[PDB]
Amino acid sequence: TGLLDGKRILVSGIITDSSIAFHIARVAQEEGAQLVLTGFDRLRLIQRITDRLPAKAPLLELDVQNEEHLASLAGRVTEAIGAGNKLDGVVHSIGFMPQTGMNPFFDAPYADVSKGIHISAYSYASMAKALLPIMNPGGSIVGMDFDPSRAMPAYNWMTVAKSALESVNRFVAREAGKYGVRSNLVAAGPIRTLAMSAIVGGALGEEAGAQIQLLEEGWDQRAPIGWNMKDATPVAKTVCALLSDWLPATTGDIIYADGGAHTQLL
Amino acid sequence: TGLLDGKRILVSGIITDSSIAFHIARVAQEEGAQLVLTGFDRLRLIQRITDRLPAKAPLLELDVQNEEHLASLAGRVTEAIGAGNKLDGVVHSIGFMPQTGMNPFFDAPYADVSKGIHISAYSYASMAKALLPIMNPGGSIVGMDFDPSRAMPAYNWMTVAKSALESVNRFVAREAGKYGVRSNLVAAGPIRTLAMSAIVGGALGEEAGAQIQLLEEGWDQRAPIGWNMKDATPVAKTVCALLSDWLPATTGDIIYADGGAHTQLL
Amino acid sequence: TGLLDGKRILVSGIITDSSIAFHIARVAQEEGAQLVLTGFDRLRLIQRITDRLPAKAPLLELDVQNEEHLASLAGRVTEAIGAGNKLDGVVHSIGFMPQTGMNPFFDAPYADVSKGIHISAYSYASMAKALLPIMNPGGSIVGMDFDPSRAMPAYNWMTVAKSALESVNRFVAREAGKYGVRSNLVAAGPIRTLAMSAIVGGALGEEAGAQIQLLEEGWDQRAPIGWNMKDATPVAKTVCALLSDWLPATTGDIIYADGGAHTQLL
Amino acid sequence: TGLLDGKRILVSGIITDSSIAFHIARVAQEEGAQLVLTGFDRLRLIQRITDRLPAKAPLLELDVQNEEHLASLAGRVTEAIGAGNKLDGVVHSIGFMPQTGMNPFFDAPYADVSKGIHISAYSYASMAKALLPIMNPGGSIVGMDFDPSRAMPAYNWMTVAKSALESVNRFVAREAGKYGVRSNLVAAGPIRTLAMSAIVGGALGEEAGAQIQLLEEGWDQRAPIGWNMKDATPVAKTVCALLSDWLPATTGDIIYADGGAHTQLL
Ligand SMILES: NC(=O)c1ccc[n+]([C@@H]2O[C@H](COP(=O)([O-])OP(=O)(O)OC[C@H]3O[C@@H](n4cnc5c(N)ncnc54)[C@H](O)[C@@H]3O)[C@@H](O)[C@H]2O)c1
Ligand SMILES: NC(=O)c1ccc[n+]([C@@H]2O[C@H](COP(=O)([O-])OP(=O)(O)OC[C@H]3O[C@@H](n4cnc5c(N)ncnc54)[C@H](O)[C@@H]3O)[C@@H](O)[C@H]2O)c1
Ligand SMILES: NC(=O)c1ccc[n+]([C@@H]2O[C@H](COP(=O)([O-])OP(=O)(O)OC[C@H]3O[C@@H](n4cnc5c(N)ncnc54)[C@H](O)[C@@H]3O)[C@@H](O)[C@H]2O)c1
Ligand SMILES: NC(=O)c1ccc[n+]([C@@H]2O[C@H](COP(=O)([O-])OP(=O)(O)OC[C@H]3O[C@@H](n4cnc5c(N)ncnc54)[C@H](O)[C@@H]3O)[C@@H](O)[C@H]2O)c1
Ligand SMILES: NC(=O)c1nn(-c2ccccc2)c(=O)cc1Oc1ccc(Cl)cc1
Ligand SMILES: NC(=O)c1nn(-c2ccccc2)c(=O)cc1Oc1ccc(Cl)cc1
């Protein structure tokens, strides 16, 4: 008798125990969801990580850049959930931007930007095209986003990728609505993941690290209810809220799991 | 084992069985909530209406224009829920704008506009000031709104009142956060209430009625998942979603229960 | 051969040489505009101030709370510009919020808030209703605004008044368009006026003063082209740009003269 | 004694006499600007078109996909305007999206989308990187945009490209501010160009054509001051307003030359 009791939900984006998707999968499992998981490249690494989730879930290989993976996805999912069964939810927690994109903004070559927008924005439509035929009416497609309304230091082309992702969602909703399915994004505040901690520790340089740290601190002071960058649970709960039947008139939208920071100047 | 199981929630704004608040109260009761209700002026009428809710709830008199009602509210609530007990949720479903405000836009006198903004926008802060001292950490204040981003025909000063209400919410969140309480609004699409049907039937004139009907129709065509103006249940579910613990990092915000219409041009 | 050469423009809101309107009037006069000015209560004070403008302009008494002043305004203006002549532009640089409104947010009584919204938001429509019948096609109504999208400390009910003003503008544009007239707002960054400097110097308290100073500093760091709070000339130029024929397809809108700060997170 | 008297402005995007850039160049020339023009591929066609501008202007070859063109651009411009002279303005009126991108939204392959985002969004930063070193303090970079806030039929991936372009602008402003240069976009309503008329006449199909026509009609009814899709002059004037010194505190922003349509629901 959980929030997602009996729902069949696909969750992508697990790579480490710090991934937002890991906590999405954990909360959803605690809430009665039967999950199908997607992973990219490091499959043996992902299997080991996912063994720590409350329940066992079938792991599938999915590179969003691979057209053959996408074409075979619906088949590979139906084979995992059972014939005659469909998905009730889909979670997109996929994002990437080469080193040059997140180095000055003018120094990122288009090849790097294009790979970033492919994986971070275009993939949301790729996943929808492939999974909507095997989704039930009342279904929910959730994507992971960060507020790209105003420009910020260090994130550069990843912010551009988010602006595109938000636009992609708005169109996915048009297609998803034909199937009785909702399409929405969760705009989260900064969450200290492996990539987030490394960059803050000066992996992408000192100027990048200092800027990210000021962003994080500014977030907790702006957020009326506070913001804990070490806690992905408030984000994971919000995604489950969208996967549930408790937001039935919300599509093409963005739900801000940011502590209320986007609503405050200072 | 419901969404709001064991939560003590105050619900204002019930006047008829078509009121958005009636359905908010119904869904919340179905979800395990113990409710305290507020009514205005026509108390014998409201008692009769509320007798149709799944469970009995104490009815309290509250005119948001009455400073004595607001000052005595916390006391009257604690007396109803029991000493030592606090509220876990508050619902604002209060709105009014004299006939002249919703007649040309330039013809509404300030006395009429001021009464409208008092009841429709200022009251949200009045309620918060009075009920936050008797609210528990993790609490939720929800208000009823409609998207006032772009101007529209016939709604005129009620749209202005909504623009103010959205701004009020953003500040209420600053105060509510001190108490561990969230403050948010639900921006709903058109819902055929008694006031809504009367105005559409030419109560406020022909030009007003025709404009409202075009608004309603335009809403269903824009909304990717459709929009049923005769169904307040998708709205009522969204308010309960905010009263729950499933949106814990959302404050000073607006959740659109509009079928996705605000995200689409046409 | 200036930007507003031969244009007849009404300018309200001059009280001191630090008023945004004083600089609006100065730039417009430098640009070939023949001006009609409105003042409130301290008429002998305003006459003395306005004597410092590049050219002499007729001063008119206008309290926006006075219904008789508004009703007699068109007549008093036509008598000043000459019979058969009309206004080509109108400038609204009027704003007020009692001490309690800008003291905690919950402590402001409605009487104080209502006076604030009357003078700061409703007056924009009052002025439009009165001056549109004496405005020429191609005309321009400009109002002074500050970004109320996100809540901020100390400004409280003045921010709410701005949110309402922006909504009012959107409706004024509907009425103004019938006359071939544009209606827009200029959202300026902080400008060190007499009221602004006093409040920063601890007139409205220490917490208020400290918050305003942090707002000002944060503005210059966010603004890509910088922000000089001691210089109202960039604001005054933007208002003239809207009074000109160089923004002919912009109405119901907001032009941000803020140094680009609203477009940047940090 | 014009708006841009003595200003040296680069204008890209001229292909036909119906191109928004042709009218931008015409108005700017009428306003005292000395222009440098860029063209793509069909150089003999562009030279013939540009011969109809009020004054002769040097034409330069610039494919935004060509890294050698961008690297040699500053040199080729300085050689055209004269050594020691710099640009005071830059106009980006470049946009493209393959046939599949504007066919269902899910059917556009990434190769087509990537080419579109390259030419329509990334190119804005490419141009800025190359031309900022040869731009004077007080300079202005203007880009052509359409409101991508809400999704619409038929435009699909071109809308996504615009959402990215708006984000790109916000970052370009950060870099441009270092040089004392402003960076802004002009969001125009539909303008009947050769590509616009062809698509409306059923070049991209019937469903696409019908949708574009409904968009155009809906624009004129929403716009308080009206909207003439056959007139690019109001757009061209707005770009010149941004190239002027009359909007000195506006950067990373969007100016809507849409007749006020984005501010109105219906
Ligand atoms: N970290 C934050 O603070 C933050 C905030 C808001 C939103 N987000 C978003 O949340 C999502 C997940 O990020 P995270 O913070 O959990 O980090 P993460 O590194 O744990 O997740 C990114 C995931 O993308 C996957 N991925 C990359 N390239 C792929 C490809 N070609 N095919 C398929 N999958 C691919 C990786 O395998 C990984 O699982 C991203 O969309 C990110 O932008 C992050
Ligand atoms: N009807 C719609 O389509 C729609 C859409 C979105 C939001 N809303 C909002 O939902 C809320 C409820 O409206 P509804 O549509 O259910 O209509 P309704 O008439 O049933 O509710 C309005 C309520 O306001 C109360 N009220 C008025 N003056 C009051 C006062 N002085 N003190 C206390 N209460 C007072 C009335 O008693 C009534 O219960 C309003 O805030 C409204 O603006 C309505
Ligand atoms: N100061 C800033 O930083 C800032 C920034 C953006 C926008 N604004 C806005 O600019 C406008 C002008 O403010 P300012 O900063 O120049 O300060 P100001 O004190 O010089 O101007 C306010 C004006 O409002 C007039 N006014 C007040 N009550 C009135 C009434 N009843 N009838 C008629 N006029 C009345 C006053 O006489 C005065 O001229 C206001 O709308 C304000 O909110 C100010
Ligand atoms: N047409 C409208 O209604 C409308 C409305 C708002 C904004 N816009 C924008 O205005 C701009 C100009 O479009 P238009 O309507 O004048 O049409 P247009 O076809 O006349 O202009 C597009 C231009 O892009 C150029 N271009 C394409 N690929 C290029 C490349 N690889 N390198 C360099 N230049 C390249 C073309 O040569 C052409 O001059 C575009 O950015 C467009 O999206 C158009
Ligand atoms: N905390 C981070 O370092 C971070 N990381 N990413 C990210 C980028 C690529 C891949 C995975 C996550 C994001 O997408 C966002 C990140 O933090 C932000 C940045 C900006 C904002 Cl508004 C909110 C959160
Ligand atoms: N359907 C209606 O007639 C209606 N009614 N009210 C309203 C006004 C005063 C009191 C109660 C409800 C609203 O506040 C809003 C109403 O409909 C709208 C109007 C505009 C929009 Cl964007 C969405 C819904």
Ligand SMILES: NC(=O)c1nn(-c2ccccc2)c(=O)cc1Oc1ccc(Cl)cc1
């Ligand atoms: N600098 C100030 O102190 C100030 N003052 N007023 C104000 C209020 C009432 C009457 C005149 C001006 C405003 O309306 C705005 C003011 O500064 C702000 C405040 C917030 C923002 Cl976003 C931008 C500028």
Ligand SMILES: NC(=O)c1nn(-c2ccccc2)c(=O)cc1Oc1ccc(Cl)cc1
């Ligand atoms: N009228 C059109 O057909 C049109 N064409 N383009 C376009 C696309 C690619 C190249 C040049 C112009 C656009 O970028 C925009 C166009 O019209 C729109 C479409 C949407 C909106 Cl919100 C406003 C105008």
